[PDB]
Design a protein around this ligand. Structure first.
Ligand SMILES: COc1ccc2c(n1)C1(CCN(C(=O)c3ccc4[nH]ncc4c3)CC1)C(=O)N2CC(=O)N1CCC[C@H]1C(F)(F)F
Ligand SMILES: [Cl-]
Length: 293
């Protein structure tokens, strides 16, 4: 049984987010002997028995995860109240808002440090870290179910970590299909068998990664299928099922060469078994994509 982090050492500084059962604060750790900034998730002030149960379950889930490109618990406080989970502070926030504030470079390495520009090789590097994170989760047979740039965090030096904020942020409400007034399904990231059969697998996470890769190469300027309605996106899932060549795909991003786009298309194969494994996606993004055509 791991020992609790010493709660008294936290200095609460700013609120970073609010989710379904917890809320996240930026904290300073008063002199770190085993300015240090960490993110700390605690129960919402309106927490009921249901919220505490959900929080204790998440501690269990998070205890499974140990990879540089996945959120990791730096510590916990669970033996007594208040309950806390502690992770690294990622100073550049979510990847969607981050990339949207950048523009693609003209020539490689032409700008000054700090400028809001980004290279194609850096887009590859961001995607490759996401693929490495997902490759890790696949080995634990952990199915994420909501991969997208909004659920990735950005630290120093463009390091990426996969998280899962839930469907709670007003900022991203448009990314979720609603049933009975609440967000339920990120349909624009969902494989046709997720929509039609309710089947979530590693291969559907591969489909979502394809959309996330599309997002990254679009520098998060547009929503997937952004000029189609939710009903049309759901209808498109039906055309994948019927397989008579009426299905439509996300278009090739301007910044994306044809070779990379064809691998993206493979992520959206009708048959789950034909989609690439995350091992192959990572190898391509990390090495083959640097090849000169
Ligand atoms: C502090 O302790 C925790 C513990 C868990 C989580 C979290 N914190 C956040 C971390 C981002 N988050 C911010 O509100 C947030 C916002 C800005 C920030 N900057 N630096 C850190 C940070 C965190 C929601 C809670 C989050 O998503 N979760 C879920 C999570 O990671 N899950 C759920 C299943 C397994 C795993 C995943 F990805 F693999 F699916
Ligand atoms: Cl569109």
């Amino acid at each position: 049984p791991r020992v609790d982090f010493p709660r008294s050492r936290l200095r609460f500084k700013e609120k970073l987010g609010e989710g379904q059962f917890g809320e996240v604060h930026l904290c300073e750790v008063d002199s770190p002997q085993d300015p240090l900034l960490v993110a700390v998730k605690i129960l919402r002030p309106d927490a009921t028995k249901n919220a505490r149960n959900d929080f204790l379950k998440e501690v269990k889930i998070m205890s499974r995860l140990k990879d540089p490109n996945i959120i990791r618990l730096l510590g916990v406080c669970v033996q007594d109240d208040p309950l806390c989970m502690i992770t690294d502070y990622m100073e550049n926030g979510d990847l969607n808002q981050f990339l949207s504030a950048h523009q693609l470079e003209d020539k490689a390495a032409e700008g000054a440090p700090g400028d809001p520009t980004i290279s194609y090789p850096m887009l590859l590097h961001v995607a490759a870290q996401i693929a490495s994170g997902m490759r890790y989760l696949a080995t634990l047979n952990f199915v994420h179910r909501d991969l997208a740039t909004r659920n990735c965090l950005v630290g120093e030096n463009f390091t990426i970590k996969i998280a899962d904020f839930g469907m709670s942020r007003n900022l991203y409400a448009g990314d979720y299909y609603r049933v009975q007034g609440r967000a339920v399904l990120p349909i624009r990231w969902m494989a046709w068998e997720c929509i039609l059969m309710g089947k979530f697998t590693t291969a559907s996470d591969v489909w979502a990664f394809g959309v996330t890769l599309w997002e990254v190469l679009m520098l998060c300027r547009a929503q997937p299928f952004g000029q189609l309605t939710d009903e049309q996106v759901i209808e498109n899932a039906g055309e994948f099922f019927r397989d008579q060549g009426r299905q439509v795909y996300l278009s090739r991003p301007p910044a994306c060469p044809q070779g990379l786009y064809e691998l993206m298309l493979r992520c959206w194969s009708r048959e789950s078994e034909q989609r690439p494994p995350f091992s192959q996606l990572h190898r391509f993004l990390a090495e083959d994509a640097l090849n000169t055509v």
